[PDB]
Amino acid sequence: PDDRSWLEHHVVHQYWTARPSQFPHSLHLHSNLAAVWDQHLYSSDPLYVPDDRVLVTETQVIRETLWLLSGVKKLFIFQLIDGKVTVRNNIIVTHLTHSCLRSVLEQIAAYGQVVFRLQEFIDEVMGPFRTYQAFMWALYKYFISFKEELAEIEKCIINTTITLAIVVDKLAPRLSQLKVLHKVFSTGVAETRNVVRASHLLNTLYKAILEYDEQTVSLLFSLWVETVRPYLQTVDEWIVHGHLWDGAREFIIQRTMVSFLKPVLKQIIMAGKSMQLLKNLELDDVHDPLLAITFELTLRSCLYPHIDKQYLDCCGNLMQTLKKDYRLV
Amino acid sequence: LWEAALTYEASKRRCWERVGCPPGHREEPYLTEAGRDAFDKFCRLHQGELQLLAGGVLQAPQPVLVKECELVKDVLNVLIGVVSATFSLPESISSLLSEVAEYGTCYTRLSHFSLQPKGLVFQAFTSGLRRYLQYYRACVLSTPPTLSLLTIGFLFKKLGRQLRYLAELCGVAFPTGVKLLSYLYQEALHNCSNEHYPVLLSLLKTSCEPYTRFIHDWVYSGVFRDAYGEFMIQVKLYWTHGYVVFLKHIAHDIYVCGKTINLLKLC
Amino acid sequence: MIHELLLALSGYPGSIFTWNKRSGLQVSQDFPFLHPSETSVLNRLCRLGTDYIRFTEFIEQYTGHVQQQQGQGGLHGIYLRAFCTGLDSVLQPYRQALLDLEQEFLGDPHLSISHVNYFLDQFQLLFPSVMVVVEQIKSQKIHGCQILETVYKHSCGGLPPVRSALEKILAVCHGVMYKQLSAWMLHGLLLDQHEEFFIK
């Protein structure tokens, strides 16, 4: 009445309260399919009850699917029933009698489960491990550019409306990467010590680059560099501060392993020790300019001169000060 | 064309509800869609949900008012000191207003404390506060010349708190004379660095001008100057010069240089 | 709606989004020109504004207590006059971002609440991480030069925004310390601030 009449007659509330649809009708086919679909229901037996539920139009489902794939969760459809989102099937959509539509929304909710897992790993810090944190940061840098697209697409519904098939085919170069992210996250939660709990994710990330060596491997590379930030920072701390960073032994060296830094590993240990044996008498910010200006083949062999020159300087200076004023020979 | 063409136009979406031979009709609008025209309907409805739990008499003023710009001009008038129609000297407009009223109500408490320019250093402190008044009147109605509502609250949040500290510094007894000038002195040692530190430094820089003028008297003319008793040295054996801010180490030199100038006047 | 929320996110405790000491900024009024899935979206958003309110309260509450009434008591010292000075500086870009939202709603007023939450997802990375430092300062009796310690433990961080915010706070605290070291090296003055800066 008055205000509530305007609210019900121009917008929904037949979608969160069981009311008949206010989306306009006429008679026959697309207008009102109710008579002929009731006849088809009666002829083939509607069992013992005609199929009728609350009924919603397509666009509400479209913006809910884009909200679910966008990153936010717990909607009216795609309810989380036991830990994984799935379609609410107590809503009728009259053509297809929501059985084919159940299959298509079940596939979309299966992708929404991956979205839920990534947002769940996000939520377990906001609202330390220091390698999971650098992982969820590059995950954030993906998701900001990711749901930018879905916000842009959802704007075009308001400005006439655009069908569901166009907007699910529009997000294909993101969902193709979402399957890669699904395989990435699986060993990041699968897991004793904090060093093997990071090694299990980082060796999988190092292996997955060789799987696609398009657009996925560049995402994997930009994700991969931003998860070894604590290790490059810790190695540089071992060089120039003379001390390995401690996190209840987050690091590999006790004071198996990943193969990211193993072929240069003898050039690292013999560096860091040689600083403290000098004192007993930055480096990541060189690697990132290379990232500013084929990956894990030629670019990986350019990382090793960075630590190799600093290593050579440190060990040569230590050898020089032992070969004069003590003079081992 | 325009509205008629949009009203006619068949949609590129065909629903999964019904298929085959549509006449086509648009989008079903959303409820967060166009979020600035339906406050009125719900301000009545929230009032109703409140009245059901409250028995029937609790109410809630402001189901709307007024515009963006008129509300902005009234809130800008609050900081000067003119109260609005809701004061005398949606529902969360009052949630804004309580924090911009308070910053307003202390500003008058400086201008009322600067209505007159006692003690001469007290007048110097009042004239120093007048400089912050003259800065603050230039700050407002240059950067917000009737812009939207939240620019008013954001711009004078970092600035209004600095003003509220100066409300705590003033009384609106209150120290006066040298008891004021030491009290402003010790405060400058108490606050080494804060956003209120340059304001206290600007007050203290002009609050010692009459004291330096009193210091200039005994050396250059041998004059003991008092008008309210606002100088530290106040009132025999040959000289009647007064004897019981600077240290006492300089004050004794001032006391003996007045006697020296009294001897040299006859030389 | 898209100014009322932006008012509740800033230094006002609202009344639409009710301020509570057990659960800050609750949306409970389920507006029939909001979508019901925006309620959870607001429940995601309101923790950020709650943190902004707490930081605003921390600057309003503490300034040499009130006006200089050893150096224990609650949370003061010339370094936390500096800490509130730095806390206001880290709350300034949030005000700038809300101004950008206000100009965007001059551009397009048909954007939903999820767009606003998405725009302010960048400050949900900075604010929860710096909230814990202020909570450790409040819970433990750390108010002297060890506040510079407990900032410096967390200012070496893992995210570029939280690094910048704790950089600002640590910077103004070093500014106080270097002025009192200038009194140490030019005037020979010790206890500029009584027992609060590396001096018996």
Residue A310: HSE in the Cβ half-sphere, 13 Å Cα cutoff? 22
Task: Give the residue from A238, A164, A241, A242 showing the smallest Cα distance to A252.
Answer: A238
CB contact under 8 A, C159 and A75: no
User: A85 pairs with which residues across the strands?
Assistant: A80
**Chain center to CA of A127:** 18
Cα first-last separation, chain B: 105
Sign of the dihedral defined by the CA atoms of residues A121, A122, A124, A129, in that order = positive
Identify all chain A residues contacting C159, using CB atoms and an 8 Å cutoff.
133, 137
Closest in B35, B39, B96 to C12, CB measured = B96
Phi first, then psi, for residue A28 (nearest 5°) are 80, 120
Measured CA distances, B35 to A281, B30, B121 (Å): 71, 10, 57
The count of other CB atoms within 10 Å of the CB of residue A309 is 11
Mutation to test the C interface, candidates B94, B106, B193, most C Cβ within 10 Å: B193
And the tokens for C106? 């001059």
**Which chain A residue is nearest to residue B18, measuring alpha carbons?**
A30
Say how far apart CA A260 and CA A272 lie, in whole Å.
18
Cα first-last separation, chain A: 103
Say how far apart CA A126 and CA C129 lie, in whole Å.
8
Sign of the dihedral defined by the CA atoms of residues B142, B147, B153, B158, in that order = negative
| In contact, B107 and B180? CB cutoff 8 Å | no
Say how far apart CA B63 and CA B44 lie, in whole Å.
7
CB contact under 8 A, A151 and C115: yes
Ramachandran assignment for A252, one of left (phi > 0), alpha (psi -120 to 50 degrees), beta (any other): alpha
And the tokens for B176? 């006066």
Residues of chain B in Cβ contact (below 8 Å) with chain C = 30-36, 38-39, 41-42, 45-46, 49, 90-92, 94-96, 98-99, 148-151, 153-154, 157-158, 161, 165, 168-169, 186-187, 189-196
Three-state DSSP at C26 gives strand
Q: Which helix (H) or strand (E) holds A3?
A: helix A3-10
User: A80 pairs with which residues across the strands?
Assistant: A85
DSSP state at residue A90: S
Helix A216-225, helix A284-292: angle, nearest 10: 160
Q: What contacts B2, CB < 8 A, 6 or more positions away? A: none
Say how far apart CA B165 and CA B160 lie, in whole Å.
9
The residue assigned the tokens 């697209």 is: A149
- Give the helix ranges, DSSP H, for C62-191: 78-107, 113-119, 123-139, 146-152, 160-186
Question: For chain C, how many residues are written?
Answer: 200
| In contact, B166 and B110? CB cutoff 8 Å | yes
Mutation to test the C interface, candidates A66, A126, A147, most C Cβ within 10 Å: A126
Distance (Å) from the alpha carbon of C126 to chain B's nearest alpha carbon: 20
Resolution, given in Å to one decimal, reads 7.8
| In contact, B229 and B177? CB cutoff 8 Å | yes
User: A86 pairs with which residues across the strands?
Assistant: A79
| In contact, C184 and C68? CB cutoff 8 Å | no
Q: Which helix (H) or strand (E) holds A80?
A: strand A79-80
| In contact, A234 and A251? CB cutoff 8 Å | yes
The b-or-e profile of B55-83 (16+ CB within 10 A means b, else e) is eeeeeeeebeeeeeeebbbbbbebbeeee
Three-state DSSP at C13 gives coil
And the tokens for A79? 């309810």
And the tokens for B231? 């100088």
Task: Give the residue from C81, C120, C78, C73 showing the smallest Cα distance to C101.
Answer: C120
Measured CA distances, B78 to B30, B89, B156, C56 (Å): 38, 11, 12, 22
Identify all chain C residues contacting B161, using CB atoms and an 8 Å cutoff.
59-60, 88
| In contact, B17 and A167? CB cutoff 8 Å | no
Amino acid at B62: Q
Say how far apart CA C139 and CA C148 lie, in whole Å.
16
Three-state DSSP at B190 gives helix
